[PDB]
Each structure stands twice: as structure tokens, then as C-alpha cells.
């Protein structure tokens, strides 16, 4: 037993981390096959980021401008296209270490593993949530752009994020590995506002499961409530509504406790009301919303 | 910016995790050279477990009863023998993923990464702190016994720790690589304590420090403090006494901020005595102690 914020197994990610440098601006890529993905700000100058023509900026560089190198080998690159928000850098040739991956858009809510790289080498890695309002709060200093978030099913890799930004307010920003921007944010030094964020209701949910799997019963109560009677307390305290879905996804947890979902509701909904009282739940002394159902099903059985 | 429990990348474990069979007990094991360490517990049966006799245990068992599968190819096991309590079993290939290492003994209150495996398969990756009981606060299940813990230093791997069990009371107990546990815990299936627990103090000051680089200065105040009186609230709290070894290390801190560790104390002292009054700091609302000064420093600077 006990459970812990958990990230995924790193290796097969470190594999493929490289460093990119064009011009003056050295960041994080990602080698898989014979393509170098990173983000295309890796173009710009400290002047070029406030406003960006990115498509006039990439017609300046040639392929021997983008300096990729693996560990402590060169690579040779033969092509460079932009894709949205990403540079894809066509090398001559294939990672050896790649791993089998995919290449998924995650939803608001779900989690990922996300491996902090510096200069193409990794320093760290850590568990996130994609925020409601699609941002991360990563740990991120300059050079750190071009980390990948990921998800490990087994032996594939499915890369859900690429590192571009932070905003002015210290979270942050980034695209899948297509370089579409999860929300609403541009790759340009502006002011830019991420909206409203809310907890993840399904991910508190989960956590409060495991934490009666894990002993932490001291919030379990004599009450039951109904979704519609759950999502006004959950609106009032700005956690997203709860569906059918959500409770469908809480299902294998509900059956494993023997605590139906609306009784869980319910003491979610009290532990809103009067706060813990100074109390903790799995060593936390707030609601943890960086758990799905599928992570603390994973973790409470030991899948590898 | 931006602050999280970050492990160290785990591949360089990752390519040193095996299987371990004897008789019906399966568990991990580490190859590092043409050695492998697994908990000497592998060759005890539930029975076995109540009042082991190990080295009586021992000599029922085999070279060829050690079943060591590296993934999916078979070791060929040469050698056997107990050190404290750790099996090493000399096989006959060395592992070609063995990265640079050390065995180091850390010290209480010091944090390390743990790669829980299951099968010689890892699963997940998350950064612990040895309590100063010498207990730590993991996530272990069934099967997990010989996953390892273990810092990184540019290239080279220090192992640290290797997960034996879970006392009665759900904290986790275990061994240095050379078998020797760390507490007074043995290896066998009895009511065994672990003595008080103490939050450990330099950490809580070095988050502190952290929280105030990253943005989270509302637990500033006016005050000062001096040692004595600082230790004097810390024992009231159970928080380990405050040392000028402890003030030292904080010393790179204290001159980035301009915040002198006395008047870190001060705040610390008011948070101790006023709480959080339902604030947070670093989005935790308790106080953080599984961030040493290095830690700290580490992930405030980008070190790789
Ligand atoms: C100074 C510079 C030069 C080149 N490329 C990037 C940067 N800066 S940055 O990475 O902090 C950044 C700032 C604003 C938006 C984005 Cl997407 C990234
Ligand atoms: C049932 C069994 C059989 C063989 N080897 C280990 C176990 N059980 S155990 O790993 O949970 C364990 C229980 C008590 C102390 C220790 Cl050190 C380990």
C-alpha cells in the first residue's frame, strides 16, 4: 500500500531527448524515426518573440542552421518543415533507441509524465494534469523548451506534449506533437490569459477511492446526495461538473470499495463545506485532482 | 519557474532491473555488473517469514533454484551468498546497460528516487525522503520488493535503498545495497516499530526558500528569530532541532533570496504557531519537508 504521485519510467523518453540550436537559441528536441520534432520559437531571437513572423522567419534558416545533436554526435539534417507550432527536422538518420509511440492529443483533466531536459539531457521527471484550462504547472526554466509529456502503455509511448511557454503568471503552456497549442495560447511574448481554472471532480473523486483502499477513511460519512444536488456544491467551489461519464470511469473503483459513487459525492461534497479541519488525506492537506481513475487503478494494482 | 516532487530520470535503473525467482516467490533484483541484489526474504516461503532462519534457508538452496530473467533472456546464476539482508548472485554475463554507480549509505531527512517494479518490470518513478526514523512513505504492493532507490550525479548512478517491506502500520522499511537495513527494522514478519517521526526542518526551510524564489512570499514576515528560540518551537512541533550545519547549507539559499535563515525561522515559527490559515505555499497546504537544500537548488537551476 501507499500511494504517491507517480510518474512513468522515463528511459524510453530519454532516449529520445536531443538538443536543437539555431542561432543563439538552444532548446529540447525529440528524435523519433528520422525526424527531429521541436518547438519552432527555436527560430527566434529575443527580439523575434515579441511578434513573430514565423513563416518569414524559417525562410532565412537552411538545414545545416539547425544544429542537432545526440548526446555527443552530430546529426546530419536533410529536410526542415514547420507543422503548426512545431519544427520537424527530417535527419539522415534513425534513432536506434526509438521506442514503439504514438502520437495523442490528451483531454483537459487527463494526466502525463513530463521529462524536464536541459541542453538535451534530462534532469527530472514528474507527474502533471492538463488543467480545464489546458495549461500545466510544470517546473520549467529557460533552456527546459522541447520537453515532452508523455504516457507509457506497456512498451509504447504515446507523446502527448511538447514545452513552449510560460505565461506571465508562472503556468504553462505548450502543443501536442502535431504543434497545435492545447488552449487558446500563441507561441509570442504577450500577455496572454489562461481562463478560469476548476478541479478535476472525476481525478478528487479517484484519489478519495484510493485513499479508503490506502486507510484514509475519516472522511467517509452517514450521507448520500444526488449528481444534480453534487454539481451545485461543485459549482460554488469551481470544480467541474460531474456526468454519467465520470461516474461510469469511477465504476471498477466504486465495486472494488463497495462505496457507491454518489456516497463518495457526498463526502466530497461535506469535506467542501467544512474543509479537513486540519486533517489529511494520503499525507495531502487539500483535495488531490492530479489522479485519474485509470491512475489510481494502475497504482493500487501494480500495472508495470 | 515553477516547483515539483521531481525524480531523477530512471532509465540508467531501468536497464538494471530484473526478475528473481526462488521456489514460489518472485520479486526484483538489480544487475549491476555480473552481480544481481535481491532481499534474501526471496528464498522464504509465508511460513518461512513468521521466524526466518536464513542462513539455515540458504543452504536448502541452489545455484540453479535462483531463477534470473534479464526481460525476456535467462541468466546463468554461477555464485551465491548472503550479505546481511541481500542475496548476490553471480551470474555469468555482465550487464551491458550497467551504468556508472556507487553504494551509498544516506543519511535520515536525505531524498532519493525510487523505480517501483514489479515482475523486474518497472512501473513508476517518484521522489521519497528517508524519514528520520529511517522509515519511508512509499508505494509499494505486492511483487515490489527489491525495487531500489537510488540520486544521480551527471553520469553516475548512487543506490541507496532497496525495498524489503511494509511494516503493519503502512510505512516502508528497507536496506542499503549491502544489506543492512536502515532503522532497526528486520526482515521478518513481526510487529516491529518505527519509532516518532520528525518533520525534517532544513527542508521545510529549503522549500521555503523555493516557495520565495518561485513567487509565494505571503508567509514573509517582520520577525526575526535566533536558534534557541526557533528550537524551542520546533520541538513543541516535532520538528527536528535546527543545527548551524543545517544554517550552512542553507547558506546558498539565503544569499540568492537576500532572506537571512534566521528570518526563514521566523516565518517558519509563525506558520508553525498560526498554521497556513486555509493559504498554500508551492500549492501544498502543509509544510513540505522532502526537498533538501541540494534538491532545491538543483531544480532552481536546471542541473542535468
Ligand atoms: C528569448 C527567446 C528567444 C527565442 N525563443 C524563445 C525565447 N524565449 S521563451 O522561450 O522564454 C518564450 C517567450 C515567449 C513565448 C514563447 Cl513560446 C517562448
Ligand atoms: C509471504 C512472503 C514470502 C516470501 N517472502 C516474503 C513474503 N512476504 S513480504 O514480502 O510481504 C514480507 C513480510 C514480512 C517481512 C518482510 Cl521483510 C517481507
Redesign the interface.
Known sequence: ???????????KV??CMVQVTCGTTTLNGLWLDDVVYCPRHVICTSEDMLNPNYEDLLIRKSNHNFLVQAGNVQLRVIGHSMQNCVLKLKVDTANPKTPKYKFVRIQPGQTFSV?????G??????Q?AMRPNFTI????????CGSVGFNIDYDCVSFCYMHHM?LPT???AGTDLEGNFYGPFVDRQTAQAAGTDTTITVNVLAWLYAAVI??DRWFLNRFTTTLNDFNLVAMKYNYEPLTQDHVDILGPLSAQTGIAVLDMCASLKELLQN??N?R?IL????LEDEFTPFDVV???????
Chains 1, 2 share one sequence.
Open positions: 500500500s501507499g500511494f504517491r504521485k507517480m510518474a512513468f519510467p522515463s528511459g530519454e532516449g521529462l524536464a531536459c536541459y541542453n539531457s534530462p534532469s527530472g521527471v514528474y502533471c504547472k510544470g517546473s520549467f526554466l529557460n533552456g527546459s510560460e508562472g503556468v504553462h490506502n486507510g474543509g479537513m486540519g489529511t499525507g495531502s492537506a487539500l494502475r497504482q493500487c494494482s501494480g500495472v508495470t
